[PDB]
From Swiss-Prot, chain E:
Species of provenance: Saccharomyces cerevisiae (strain ATCC 204508 / S288c)
Similarity field: Belongs to the archaeal Rpo6/eukaryotic RPB6 RNA polymerase subunit family.
Source species taxonomy: Eukaryota, Fungi, Dikarya, Ascomycota, Saccharomycotina
Subunit-level organization: Component of the RNA polymerase I (Pol I), RNA polymerase II (Pol II) and RNA polymerase III (Pol III) complexes. Component of the RNA polymerase I (Pol I) complex consisting of 14 subunits: RPA135, RPA190, RPC40, RPA14, RPB5, RPO26, RPA43, RPB8, RPA12, RPB10, RPC19, RPC10, RPA49 and RPA34. The complex is composed of a horseshoe-shaped core containing ten subunits (RPA135, RPA190, RPB5, RPO26, RPB8, RPB10, RPC10, RPA12, RPC19 and RPC40) where RPA135 and RPA190 form the DNA-binding cleft.
Name the UniProt record assigns to this protein: DNA-directed RNA polymerases I, II, and III subunit RPABC2
Keywords, alphabetical: Cytoplasm, DNA-directed RNA polymerase, Nucleus, Phosphoprotein, Ribosome biogenesis, Transcription
Swiss-Prot record, chain F:
Region (Rudder loop): 284-301
Protein name: DNA-directed RNA polymerase II subunit RPB1
Additional remark text: Mutagenesis experiments demonstrate that the minimum viable CTD contains eight consensus Y-S-P-T-S-P-[A-S-N-G] heptapeptide repeats. Identical and simultaneous substitutions in a number of consecutive repeats are lethal: 'Ser-2' -> 'Ala-2' (14 repeats), 'Ser-5' -> 'Ala-5' (15 repeats), '2-Ser-Pro-Thr-Ser-5'-> '2-Ala-Pro-Thr-Ala-5' (10 repeats), 'Ser-2'-> 'Glu-2' (15 repeats), 'Ser-5' -> 'Glu-5' (12 repeats), '2-Ser-Pro-3' -> '2-Pro-Ser-3' (15 repeats) and 'Tyr-1' -> 'Phe-1' (12 repeats). The binding of ribonucleoside triphosphate to the RNA polymerase II transcribing complex probably involves a two-step mechanism. The initial binding seems to occur at the entry (E) site and involves a magnesium ion temporarily coordinated by three conserved aspartate residues of the two largest RNA Pol II subunits. The ribonucleoside triphosphate is transferred by a rotation to the nucleotide addition (A) site for pairing with the template DNA. The catalytic A site involves three conserved aspartate residues of the RNA Pol II largest subunit which permanently coordinate a second magnesium ion.
Residues spanning the membrane: none
Length: 171, 142, 112, 97, 81, 538, 36, 262
RNA sequence: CGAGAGGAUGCA
DNA sequence: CGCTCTGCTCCTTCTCCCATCCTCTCGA
DNA sequence: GAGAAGGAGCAGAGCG
């Protein structure tokens, strides 16, 4: 799901950036560094609340060089998965072994081992949906998925969405 | 939990539609800061304008995330969101549970219990039946 | 009382050869040996046998014997000693390092 | 030339801490090490060419820190670990407030 | 705890040295100069000039044993050294 | 990756499971080498690679930026850690010997006071002095609150042996006698409770008694025990490398003897040998006779030897060390030199350098210096581009071709008024080191104003001093404002000025200021002009 | 160092291994700082 | 060995001394918070001299003949003589000095009257006299109220501590008790008229100048005193000596034990 | 590469 | 008289001693 | 060969 959490981040500035512009410039740098972040602790970082009134908290000048470190505090919106969650998502891509669906900012694979036993891949369909049962799932159609844990990766975060359940079925 | 402000703020189980509303407000304020420097279809297109006018477009996933979240947005009218917030939170429902009901479509109490195991064991179905029908009525209005 | 006696006793030794050093330097020494509620010598069996940071204690007269004692006792050093920082090679919190220098963003903008 | 123990004492007296650091680091022994946040040990695989880090035995790939210490200091700890002692280094004081 | 700071208003020799060194380092790195140049190519002399007339944009944090601290703007401090 | 600084240090003992977890490989063979390759079970590429081999456990970077990684040795039998043999003895004197509890408990008033001690080090110290006197762990102990009631605490309820130190092993003398089984001690320690750790000062997560007995040895990688090629590709590897090979052979034999028929006795000695080697490896200098000797006949240098003692890895490489950007030579006097000045041999200034930064205020001067080149004095050696391109002006005509850019560094030679630091060994006190202003002179010795020798305790009879050149801009200011000679005219040691007029200069003042001295006009005019501060008024 | 080759001696030990010795000479002029 | 004992002793911003563990050693460095480098021996004129002599050098009586103030000393003559109000100020001043006189007799039993103290007052007065060649041959424009009030105001500015609680203030009073005893001694109203015939402008200049000089001599926080004390003892130690080793090492078995009974 | 030896260097 | 128990004494067991330079030699 | 920390042993007064 999505949560609002006060997060902190440390930024170091080269001396050349020690001009009056830092008020807005450091907020900017925070925005580039923070926006669009993937992390197992906090899942996906979506947006930073209160884009003004950001907590600079005074720069700390290092002794090695003229760069100054800033402990930036900010409120931001993050997305997190939980084991055994239900999501009203949609199919992103089709595959013989299952489907890939969108779960907010996260990609979930809907594996054939966990779609209904009566539901089987139908290569003939275009897209090649699963059509052997009433649960017709395709890229264009919506899908409720059942998050079977989380599988985080360095580049991104993904999980497994099961459909073989009394709920969280197709569409 | 505790925020970084020294304040013991409890976990914010933010709802999907209310999350979208908050993000829209944040994008509007971001465009404002730059200046100092509804149906799901209308909302989806409008946000993309804010995202394009507030970000550089590098992070398309958030644009996708908002677009697909808007498609499944269940309480688009912010004013109606206030009702569901009161409907669920006023009952003492655990925030983790509140977000699910206020983000996922559900008709009957058993369906909510069926979908959410945590509710199945301790929740009052009578409130579910009352609230879910109220929210279901609100859901149809969109 | 002994602390006063110690100062007088040490004072005689220094003044005996005609030399003179400021009262403060003696006073600090005698005070240190009595801060522990008793005449603590300055040997490996006195000053060394303190509760100070283990890493700092390592360099006085015993090195490996102290390490084992710490590991057995799960000792923890606060890193406020000068030598500790020296071993880690960090700016000891002394003199020029006894404080932190931070950018006054307010003044910077206020000045143009 | 030897900058022995007696030498630094005078610098300590003057209080010229910053210069002392330069002599003890910049002159010689400068070295960088990676340390696991969970366990304060130099047990980090540094795939700098791939910008990938990992601490086997902790399954940690996020709690890595660059630290500058005298190369002799690294040798000291590595010998200590061979001695079955655990010099755990932590970058965050336990006494918060 | 800026309200009723307990440290002396005068400026210590060590912190004088630290401020001068740091500001000179900033000048060497093309940091913004706040005083007109009379040909003092010496960055240290530039920093000395800056300090003499209180143009350094730095704030010093004095620490107390208990871990608390006081914050002082270099303008606030009085220099007699 | 993130940068930080050390804030606190925590010590403790390895968990053997942790040791195995960290290890990137298991050592199995004593052989280090068909001609150049290394045995996978020792000094393999998974440890610190040898030069030109960018593996270091797939860490590449040769040795420049990559340390080593620890190995693992699975010992056949547990052995006692030498440093804790006495400590292990003390704890075993307090435990209930196959019960896991302490010989005595809190139900006695004394232990409550001892258990009330805040200092952990004193805590067990008081307890040990008390428990060691107890010789029985009876199950039922009369309660102080109810003497008629006895606390059924002692699980064993039996007596205990008296423990005696036997070289590398302990002997349990039962009041009715045998060598204590190292394995049993693990069982006794494993029975200890966390509550007991608090009484014994042990940390539940950092130092547990059972971990005081070595079941696996962390093998340091080659960087700790560097490979030696002193002679024509001759190994002569460090003692530790040979020492470990011995332990492997000892351990391998102990396993071999057990497997091959279990000749019980032969296993007994082999255990002592393994106990002997491990003890010597960690420390080859014990109270007892046992003394490992290298095949050359010299004693084997154990790790403690490398670390303990002056010129060890503490006092000889951390409290002090060899430094560069420094000079040493003989000194001489010069009355024509100001206090804060010093004559530096012209050659030395052409060797030491300073990393000055290219800025709009000095680009012109630096440009010329690079044009001069390292050969002439007022020149520089290396031009450092922002990317780290240390262009060596010595081996390039580019001295007349490079165009400097802002942010680059130039290894400027020492020039006049550069603040530098002196020191006369021994540096007895603060005044033994001050900062001066360089003055380049064409003769091979340092020059001082006559009057600065009093604090230095110097002497022109052939004494030497050490010259140190700061490298960072901050340091220059730091010295010029704290350690400059004039700042130390008056010392806090005795509230007295340290310098004055000495030797001939002092005598001249007596004659000069004597009542009957008169100076002719011709002499006076010259004498005035010498005073650089004269206002021109006769 | 600095100097000129004074006399080169080529010989052999009892083992037939050729040995070379080179003596180099130079003049030391009393300089500023030399001890007396 | 010695330097390691004091390797980590330093003065903190609260003007106290602590080791690496934060344990206190002295609540005020050197018991006065004054830097050793700015201390030079000075006389304590109130200790010596016979009581009659002491009365002679300070006592002033505007009513009687024993200690009549000479009118020529000041532009104001009879205006001062007979003014009981001023006589009260002189009494407390004279009484105040008397308390110091007996007080110091306990601080220094032997009666020695030359101790290291900050700020050389003797030098300051001479500068004022020769600053603009004060005419020592004419009456001055000073007034006893100004002299007395100036002294009291001066004592209020000698801040070595800054805390506003009684505990800190109480130490602040003690940290300069000895010094202010010197201050009153050489700035006594009488001495400011006969021996130091200062003018009002000079007198004000002195009051301002002394404060600046005194404050500069305050120990700077962060002075690594521990090392300094060790070295300051080691150097004379290079020149009794076995005895010093006998003290640092407690060495219960002293070589030559001896008493001294009075 | 370690070990050893020599010469020291500095005192009212 | 019986038995305990801190006091005091008689052996062991280590543990540490100015910083530098500046060499040549010897044998693994 | 010198001094401090450890360990063992005689030992005489007090309680049962
Ligand atoms: Mg000499
Ligand atoms: Zn780890
Ligand atoms: Zn590697
Ligand atoms: Zn037992």
């Amino acid at each position: 799901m999505f949560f609002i959490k006060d997060l902190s981040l440390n930024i170091t500035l080269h001396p050349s950036f020690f001009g009056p512009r830092m008020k807005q410039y450091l907020k900017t740098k925070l925005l580039e560094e923070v926006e669009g972040s993937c992390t197992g602790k906090f899942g996906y970082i979506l947006c930073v609340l209160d884009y003004d009134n950001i907590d600079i908290q005074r720069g700390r000048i290092l002794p090695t060089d003229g760069s100054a470190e800033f402990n930036v505090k900010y409120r931001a919106v993050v997305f997190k998965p939980f084991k055994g969650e239900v999501v009203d998502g949609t199919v992103v891509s089709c595959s013989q072994h299952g489907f890939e669906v969108q779960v907010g900012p996260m990609k979930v694979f809907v594996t054939k081992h966990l779609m209904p036993q009566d539901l089987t891949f139908n290569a003939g369909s275009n897209p090649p949906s699963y059509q052997s049962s009433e649960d017709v799932i395709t890229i264009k159609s919506r899908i409720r998925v059942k998050i079977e844990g989380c599988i985080s990766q360095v580049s991104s975060i993904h999980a497994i969405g099961s459909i073989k359940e009394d709920y969280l079925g197709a569409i | 939990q505790i925020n970084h402000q020294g304040e013991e703020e409890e976990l914010i189980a933010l709802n999907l539609s209310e999350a979208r509303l908050v993000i829209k407000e944040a994008l509007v304020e971001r465009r404002r800061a730059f200046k100092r420097s509804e149906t799901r279809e209308k909302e989806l297109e409008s946000i993309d304008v804010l995202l394009e006018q507030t970000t550089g477009g590098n992070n398309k996933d958030l644009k996708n995330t908002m677009q697909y979240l808007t498609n499944f947005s269940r309480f688009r009218d912010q004013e109606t969101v206030g009702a569901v917030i009161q409907l669920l939170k006023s009952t003492g429902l655990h925030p983790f549970e509140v977000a699910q009901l206020g983000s996922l479509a559900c008709d009957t109490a058993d369906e909510a219990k069926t979908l959410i195991p945590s509710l199945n064991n301790k929740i009052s179905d009578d409130e579910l039946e009352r609230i879910l029908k109220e929210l279901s009525n609100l859901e149809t209005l969109y | 009382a002994g602390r006063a006696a110690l100062y007088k006793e040490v004072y005689n030794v220094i003044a005996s050869d005609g030399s003179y050093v400021n009262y403060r330097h003696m006073a600090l020494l005698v005070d240190v040996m009595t801060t522990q509620g008793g005449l603590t010598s300055v040997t490996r069996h006195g000053f060394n046998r303190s509760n100070t940071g283990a890493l700092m204690r390592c360099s006085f007269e015993e090195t490996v014997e102290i390490l084992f004692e710490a590991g057995a006792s799960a000792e923890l050093d606060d890193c406020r000693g000068v030598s500790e920082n020296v071993i880690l090679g960090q700016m000891a919190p002394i003199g020029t390092g006894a404080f932190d220098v931070m950018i006054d963003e307010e003044s910077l903008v206020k000045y143009m | 030339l030897r900058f022995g123990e007696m030498e630094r004492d005078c610098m300590i007296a003057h209080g010229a801490a910053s210069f002392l650091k330069e002599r003890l680091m910049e002159a010689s022994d400068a070295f960088r090490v990676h340390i696991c946040g969970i366990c304060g040990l130099m047990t980090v695989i540094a795939k700098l060419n791939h910008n990938q880090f990992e601490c086997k035995g902790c399954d940690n790939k996020i709690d890595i820190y660059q630290i500058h210490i005298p190369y002799a200091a690294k040798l000291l700890f590595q010998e200590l670990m061979a001695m079955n002692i655990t010099p755990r280094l932590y970058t965050d004081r336990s006494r918060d407030f | 705890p800026k309200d009723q700071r307990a440290t002396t208003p005068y400026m210590t020799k060590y912190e004088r040295a630290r401020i001068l060194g740091t500001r000179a380092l900033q000048i060497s790195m093309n940091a913004p100069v706040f005083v007109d140049l009379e040909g003092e190519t010496d960055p240290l002399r530039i920093a000395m000039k800056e300090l003499a007339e209180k143009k350094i944009p730095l704030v010093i944090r004095r620490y107390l044993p208990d871990g608390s601290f006081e914050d002082w703007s270099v303008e606030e401090l009085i220099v007699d050294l | 990756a993130p940068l930080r600084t050390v804030k606190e240090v925590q010590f403790g003992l390895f968990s053997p499971e942790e040791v195995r977890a960290i290890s990137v490989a298991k050592i199995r063979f004593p052989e280090t080498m068909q001609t150049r390759a290394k045995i996978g079970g020792l000094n393999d590429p998974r440890l610190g690679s040898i030069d030109r081999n960018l593996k270091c456990q797939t860490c590449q970077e040769g040795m420049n930026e990559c340390p080593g990684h620890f190995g693992h040795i699975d010992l056949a039998k547990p052995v006692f850690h030498v440093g804790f043999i006495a400590k292990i003895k003390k704890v075993c004197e307090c435990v209930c010997m196959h019960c896991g509890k302490l010989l005595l408990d809190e139900h006695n008033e004394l232990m409550r006071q001892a258990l009330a001690i805040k200092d952990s080090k004193k805590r067990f110290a008081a307890i040990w002095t008390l428990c060691k006197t107890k010789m029985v762990c009876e199950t039922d102990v009369p309660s102080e609150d109810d003497p008629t009631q006895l606390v059924s605490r002692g699980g064993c309820g039996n007596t205990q042996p008296t423990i005696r130190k036997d070289g590398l092993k302990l002997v349990g003398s039962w009041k009715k006698l045998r060598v204590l089984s190292t394995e049993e001690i693990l069982n006794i320690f494993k029975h200890i409770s966390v509550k007991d750790f608090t009484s014994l000062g042990f940390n539940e997560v950092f130092s547990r008694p059972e971990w005081m007995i070595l079941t696996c040895l962390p093998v340091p990688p080659p960087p700790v025990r560097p490979s030696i090629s002193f002679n024509e590709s001759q190994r002569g590897e460090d003692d530790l490398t040979f020492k470990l090979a011995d332990i492997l052979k000892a351990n391998i034999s102990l396993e071999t003897l057990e497997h091959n028929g279990a000749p019980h006795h032969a296993i007994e000695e082999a255990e002592s040998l393994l106990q002997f080697h491990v003890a010597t490896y960690m420390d080859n200098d014990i109270a007892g006779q046992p003394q490992a000797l290298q095949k050359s006949g010299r004693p084997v240098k154990s790790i403690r030897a490398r670390l303990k003692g002056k010129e060890g890895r503490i006092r000889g490489n951390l409290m002090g060390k060899r430094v560069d950007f420094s000079a040493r030579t003989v000194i001489s006097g010069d009355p024509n030199l100001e206090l804060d000045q010093v004559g530096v041999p012209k050659s030395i200034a052409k060797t030491l350098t300073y990393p000055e930064v290219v800025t709009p205020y000095n680009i012109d001067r630096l440009t010329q210096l690079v044009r001069n080149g390292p050969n002439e004095h007022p020149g520089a050696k290396y031009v450092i581009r922002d990317s780290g391109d240390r262009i060596d002006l010595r081996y390039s005509k580019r001295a007349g071709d490079i165009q400097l850019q802002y942010g680059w560094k130039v290894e400027r030679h020492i020039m006049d008024n550069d603040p530098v630091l002196f020191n006369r060994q021994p540096s007895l006190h603060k005044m033994s080191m001050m900062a001066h202003r360089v003055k380049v002179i064409p003769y091979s010795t340092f020059r001082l104003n006559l009057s600065v020798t009093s604090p230095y305790n110097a002497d022109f009879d052939g004494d030497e001093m050490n010259l140190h050149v700061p490298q960072s801009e901050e340091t220059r200011a730091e010295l010029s404002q704290l350690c400059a000679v004039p700042l130390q005219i008056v010392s806090p040691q005795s509230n007295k000025p340290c310098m004055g007029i000495v030797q001939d200069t002092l005598c001249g003042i007596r004659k000069l200021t004597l009542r009957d001295t008169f100076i002719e006009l011709d002499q006076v005019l010259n004498m005035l002009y010498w005073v650089p501060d004269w206002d021109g008024v006769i | 160092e600095n100097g000129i080759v004074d006399q080169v001696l080529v010989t052999t030990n009892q083992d037939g291994l050729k040995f070379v010795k080179v003596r180099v000479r130079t003049t030391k002029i009393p300089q500023i700082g030399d001890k007396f | 060995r010695l330097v390691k004992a004091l390797e980590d002793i330093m003065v903190h911003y609260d003007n106290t001394t602590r080791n690496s563990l934060g344990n206190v050693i002295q609540f005020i460095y050197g018991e006065d918070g004054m830097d050793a480098a700015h201390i030079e021996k000075q006389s304590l004129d109130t200790i010596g001299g016979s009581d009659a002599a002491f009365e002679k050098r300070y006592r002033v009586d505007l009513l009687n003949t024993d200690h009549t103030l000479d009118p020529s000393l000041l532009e104001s003559g009879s205006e001062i003589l007979g003014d009981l109000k001023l006589q009260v100020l002189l009494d407390e001043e004279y009484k105040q000095l008397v308390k110091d006189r007996k007080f110091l007799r306990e601080v220094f039993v032997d009666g020695e009257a030359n101790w290291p103290l900050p700020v050389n007052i003797r030098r300051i007065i001479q500068n004022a006299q020769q600053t603009f060649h004060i005419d020592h041959t004419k009456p001055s424009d000073l007034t006893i109220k100004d002299i007395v009030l100036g002294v009291k105001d001066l004592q209020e500015n000698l801040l070595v501590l800054r805390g506003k609680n009684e505990i800190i203030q109480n130490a602040q009073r003690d940290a300069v008790t000895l010094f202010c005893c010197l201050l009153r001694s050489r700035l006594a109203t009488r001495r400011v008229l006969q021996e130091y015939r200062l003018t009002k402008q000079a007198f004000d200049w002195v009051l301002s100048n002394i404060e600046a000089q005194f404050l500069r001599s305050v120990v700077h926080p962060g002075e690594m005193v521990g090392v300094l004390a060790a070295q300051s003892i080691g150097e004379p130690a290079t020149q009794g000596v076995p005895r010093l080793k006998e003290i640092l090492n407690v060495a219960k078995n002293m070589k030559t034990p001896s008493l001294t009974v009075y």
